[PDB]
Amino acid sequence: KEESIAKMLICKVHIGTKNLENKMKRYVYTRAKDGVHIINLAKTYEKLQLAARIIVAISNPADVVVVSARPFGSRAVLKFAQYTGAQAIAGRWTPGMLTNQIIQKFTEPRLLIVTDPRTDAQSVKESAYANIPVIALCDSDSPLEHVDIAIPCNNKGKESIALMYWLLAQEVLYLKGVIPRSEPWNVMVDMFLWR
Amino acid sequence: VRMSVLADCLKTINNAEKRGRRQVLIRPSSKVVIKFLQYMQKKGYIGSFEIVDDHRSGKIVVNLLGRINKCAVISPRYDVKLDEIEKIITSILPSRLFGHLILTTPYGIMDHEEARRKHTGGKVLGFFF
Amino acid sequence: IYIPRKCSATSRLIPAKEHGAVQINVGMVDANGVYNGKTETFAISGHVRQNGESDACLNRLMYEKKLLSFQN
Amino acid sequence: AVQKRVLKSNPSDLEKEIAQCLLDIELSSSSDIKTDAKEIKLLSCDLIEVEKLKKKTILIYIPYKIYTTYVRKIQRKLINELEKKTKKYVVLVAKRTILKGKQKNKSFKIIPRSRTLTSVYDSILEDIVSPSEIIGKRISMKADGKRVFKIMLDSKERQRDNIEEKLISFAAVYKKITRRDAVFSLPP
Amino acid sequence: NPDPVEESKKHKLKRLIPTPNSYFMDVKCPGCLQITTLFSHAQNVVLCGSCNIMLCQPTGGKCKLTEGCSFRKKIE
Amino acid sequence: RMYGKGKGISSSTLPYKRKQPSWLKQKPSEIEDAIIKLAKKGQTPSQIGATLRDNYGIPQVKSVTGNKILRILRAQGIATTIPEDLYFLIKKAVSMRKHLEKNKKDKDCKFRLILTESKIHRISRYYKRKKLLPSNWKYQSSTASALIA
RNA sequence: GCUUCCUUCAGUACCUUAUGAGAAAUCAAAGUCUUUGGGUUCU
RNA sequence: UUCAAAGAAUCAUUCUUUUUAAAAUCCGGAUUUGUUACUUUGAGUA
Numbered sequence: 001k002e003e004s005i006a007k008m009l010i011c012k013v014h015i016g017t018k019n020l021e022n023k024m025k026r027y028v029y030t031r032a033k034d035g036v037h038i039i040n041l042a043k044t045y046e047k048l049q050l051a052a053r054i055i056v057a058i059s060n061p062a063d064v065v066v067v068s069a070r071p072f073g074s075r076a077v078l079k080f081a082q083y084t085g086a087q088a089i090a091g092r093w094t095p096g097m098l099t100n101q102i103i104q105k106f107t108e109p110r111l112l113i114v115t116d117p118r119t120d121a122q123s124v125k126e127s128a129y130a131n132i133p134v135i136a137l138c139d140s141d142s143p144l145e146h147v148d149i150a151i152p153c154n155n156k157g158k159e160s161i162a163l164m165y166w167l168l169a170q171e172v173l174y175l176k177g178v179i180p181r182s183e184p185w186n187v188m189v190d191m192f193l194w195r
Numbered sequence: 196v197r198m199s200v201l202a203d204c205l206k207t208i209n210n211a212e213k214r215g216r217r218q219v220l221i222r223p224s225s226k227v228v229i230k231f232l233q234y235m236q237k238k239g240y241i242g243s244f245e246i247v248d249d250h251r252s253g254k255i256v257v258n259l260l261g262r263i264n265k266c267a268v269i270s271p272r273y274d275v276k277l278d279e280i281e282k283i284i285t286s287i288l289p290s291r292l293f294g295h296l297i298l299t300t301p302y303g304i305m306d307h308e309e310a311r312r313k314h315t316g317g318k319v320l321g322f323f324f
Numbered sequence: 325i326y327i328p329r330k331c332s333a334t335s336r337l338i339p340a341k342e343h344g345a346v347q348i349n350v351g352m353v354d355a356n357g358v359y360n361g362k363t364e365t366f367a368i369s370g371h372v373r374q375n376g377e378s379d380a381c382l383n384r385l386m387y388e389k390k391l392l393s394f395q396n
Numbered sequence: 397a398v399q400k401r402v403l404k405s406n407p408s409d410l411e412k413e414i415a416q417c418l419l420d421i422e423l424s425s426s427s428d429i430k431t432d433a434k435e436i437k438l439l440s441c442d443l444i445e446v447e448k449l450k451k452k453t454i455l456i457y458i459p460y461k462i463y464t465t466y467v468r469k470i471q472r473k474l475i476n477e478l479e480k481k482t483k484k485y486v487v488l489v490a491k492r493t494i495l496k497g498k499q500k501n502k503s504f505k506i507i508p509r510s511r512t513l514t515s516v517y518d519s520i521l522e523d524i525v526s527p528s529e530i531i532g533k534r535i536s537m538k539a540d541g542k543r544v545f546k547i548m549l550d551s552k553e554r555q556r557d558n559i560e561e562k563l564i565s566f567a568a569v570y571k572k573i574t575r576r577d578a579v580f581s582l583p584p
Numbered sequence: 585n586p587d588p589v590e591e592s593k594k595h596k597l598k599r600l601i602p603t604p605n606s607y608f609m610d611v612k613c614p615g616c617l618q619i620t621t622l623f624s625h626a627q628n629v630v631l632c633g634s635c636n637i638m639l640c641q642p643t644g645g646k647c648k649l650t651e652g653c654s655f656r657k658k659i660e
Numbered sequence: 661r662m663y664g665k666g667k668g669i670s671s672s673t674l675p676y677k678r679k680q681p682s683w684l685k686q687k688p689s690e691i692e693d694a695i696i697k698l699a700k701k702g703q704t705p706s707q708i709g710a711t712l713r714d715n716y717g718i719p720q721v722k723s724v725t726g727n728k729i730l731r732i733l734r735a736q737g738i739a740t741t742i743p744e745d746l747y748f749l750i751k752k753a754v755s756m757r758k759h760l761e762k763n764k765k766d767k768d769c770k771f772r773l774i775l776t777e778s779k780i781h782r783i784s785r786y787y788k789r790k791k792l793l794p795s796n797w798k799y800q801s802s803t804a805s806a807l808i809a
Numbered sequence: 810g811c812u813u814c815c816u817u818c819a820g821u822a823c824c825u826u827a828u829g830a831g832a833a834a835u836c837a838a839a840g841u842c843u844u845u846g847g848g849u850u851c852u
Numbered sequence: 853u854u855c856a857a858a859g860a861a862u863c864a865u866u867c868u869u870u871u872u873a874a875a876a877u878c879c880g881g882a883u884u885u886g887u888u889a890c891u892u893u894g895a896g897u898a
């Protein structure tokens with residue numbers, strides 16, 4: 001949909017950072033005269049949709065954790081959790097969470113939704129020791145080690161991240177029976193955004 | 196420098212398999228190599244391959260089914276008599292039930308079983324699992 | 325006789341103690357966009373995940389089906 | 397009066413017809429070229445059908461010397477003329493002989509590589525397309541124990557009514573000559 | 585897909601099917617009145633037919649090509 | 661590279677099409693004549709080829725004329741007794757030797773001279789194995805200088 | 810004309826990464842090795 | 853540097869038959885074609 005694209009543009013997910021990462025090349029449309037990398041955006045949309053579908057495919061929504069150690073994605077992830085069923089982590093990920101049975105805050109999901117495999121890399125790594133699939137709202141420069149789905153966005157720009165999250169949530173809602181198509185979803189972006 | 200094109204090609208193929216490629220550009224094609232590839236295809240290990248004709252030693256690119264465990268040359272193409280085969284195969288390939296030990300034989304290239312069926316052993320090119 | 329699982333991408337076939345390797349499940353649509361009951365499935369071996377080719381493999385798989393449309 | 401002389405066989409069905417056509421062309425001076433069938437001859441012909449709704453196409457086996465000297469030079473004009481006259485698609489080829497390597501001819505001592513089977517096949521492929529010129533041969537080994545030669549021609553032919561059909565005809569003729577599957581194409 | 589590749593003629597001279605990067609040039613000076621013919625990547629200088637003037641300045645790759653001038657590629 | 665540690669791959673690589681291109685007007689006879697003229701004028705095979713490529717419109721004498729240029733020279737009878745590359749090597753060697761004679765302490769030059777000698781001996785051997793050189797032909801450091809002409 | 814940026818050659822280092830290796834130190838070669846044989850000289 | 857092609861049996865594969873050039877030989881038909889390594893059959897061995 002064009003509307004989604006427009007929204008994205010209004011935010012900033014079209015700009016990825018400098019440093020390209022060869023495996024991310026395909027998602028990037030082209031570099032600019034500045035020294036930045038513009039993401040193909042249609043790809044971002046399609047990928048996002050796919051991710052949403054995958055999320056939906058989980059039987060119960062509660063066992064699909066989401067994560068951002070970033071201060072300004074935390075809010076967004078909380079919102080996402082509230083709206084879908086999914087756990088958020090938000091902030092300090094504990095290294096034993098998906099392996100260490102006996103730990104208090106254990107909780108082993110069927111999907112892991114990272115916001116950035118650069119910063120939230122520990123979580124990603126953990127995903128390997130418990131066969132958790134991992135989708136990642138990753139940048140241009142990010143490492144895609146262990147991530148199954150890479151949604152190309154930007155993570156630097158908190159607003160953009162928030163927008164992306166919102167979009168994902170909307171998609172999931174659409175997939176489920178709760179908000180029918182043709183109707184736009186009521187809740188806004190800014191609601192997801194940090195402050 | 197090159198010496199045994201075929202060996203190099205096989206190594207390349209093996210590497211590709213290890214990585215988990217799909218396609219792979221075997222860089223100097225050779226009649227022998229082509230034959231080997233055909234044989235492999237026949238016994239299922241390889242998919243299609245598009246021997247591209249330049250105007251030189253051709254390139255092959257070959258379509259892989261994620262199925263090969265290893266394939267290899269055994270340089271010094273030892274002459275091998277029909278009685279001498281069994282020991283060689285025991286030495287080489289992982290099970291009597293499977294894998295193939297490819298001989299060039301005066302009845303074209305064929306696997307150890309084929310050779311046995313025929314009667315002629317010959318010089319031993321390579322193998323796969 | 326447990327017959328092990330073949331990585332849908334690379335066909336490598338994956339043992340019990342692999343973990344790492346994942347069976348990602350993609351839910352279907354029925355005309356509207358609503359979640360159809362059915363689910364199309366891909367197992368992905370650990371090796372590909374480690375490499376980072378996993379995403380590419382997934383894309384290719386999707387293309388092979390109808391699920392997504394660009395290939396790369 | 398002539399006509400039988402233009403071919404080099406005992407007149408049979410279609411060869412004779414072709415000869416007659418050639419003679420007519422010579423007489424008339426159709427389109428542009430004149431007195432070019434004085435130079436031309438032929439050895440034999442073969443009519444072949446294809447997997448079609450309809451249509452039969454024609455090999456014209458030409459003595460090699462003649463082909464080298466005259467037919468190579470003016471081929472496009474000739475073929476087009478033939479098409480205009482006889483709606484059957486036509487191809488010229490040189491009757492060039494193939495020799496086994498190990499064999500000992502009275503002639504030569506060592507076969508020239510011109511006469512080798514593979515070389516000959518290549519040459520006939522080159523011949524059969526002639527409005528156009530080959531870009532790249534490429535031999536797909538199917539996993540079924542088949543081999544398909546996927547030939548691709550240049551531009552030029554893309555401005556014609558007969559393209560796909562022509563390609564099919566070419567393929568058929570190749571098959572007839574050398575029991576070889578083939579497929580033809582062009583670039584977008 | 586290594587076989588049907590698209591935009592990578594920005595590979596080295598060693599592609600899938602090797603080409604040359606060089607090509608021939610239909611060239612004309614401003615007022616000699618003819619097709620002179622040329623090879624890009626020409627080492628020795630080419631003198632045009634009539635008044636023998638430098639048409640191509642020789643260099644370490646792809647001749648500098650004198651003054652304004654104009655060149656069609658030979659094509660095919 | 662045979663002798664250095666050089667590993668470069670700078671190369672001519674000819675085009676796929678090896679039947680001459682449409683735009684080539686020159687008939688073979690004319691080109692042959694031109695080649696002959698060039699040969700007479702003192703040019704060597706490679707040089708001749710280069711000249712043909714540049715000054716005249718012709719990429720490869722092999723596509724216009726069935727034969728390669730050395731072959732045609734041979735046919736015409738203006739082929740050198742002493743092959744191109746070999747001759748060049750000999751010349752180089754001679755030059756080196758002169759320098760050595762002049763200038764005795766140059767070690768690097770001496771080393772390189774040895775290398776060139778070795779290469780000559782390879783090339784020389786190869787030519788002997790064919791029939792371009794006679795079997796009675798050693799290369800001598802004393803004679804060498806006279807040989808080139 | 811030079812300068813930058815892109816691609817590419819040949820050098821040449823470094824960084825992360827190895828369901829690659831290794832006894833480990835470490836190593837893009839010390840990898841493609843009990844899934845053992847590309848060639849070859851020396852020890 | 854002769855690649856290949858087609859038919860019959862069996863449980864995608866196995867074993868078999870037939871032809872696709874050129875030269876010499878035989879009454880349009882039918883039948884010989886580098887050397888060695890290697891390999892297969894033999895032979896001959898107390």
Ligand SMILES: [Mg+2]
Binds near residue numbers: 662
């Ligand atoms: Mg050396």
Ligand SMILES: [Mg+2]
Binds near residue numbers: 667669
């Ligand atoms: Mg090299």
Ligand SMILES: [Mg+2]
Binds near residue numbers: 845
């Ligand atoms: Mg060893």
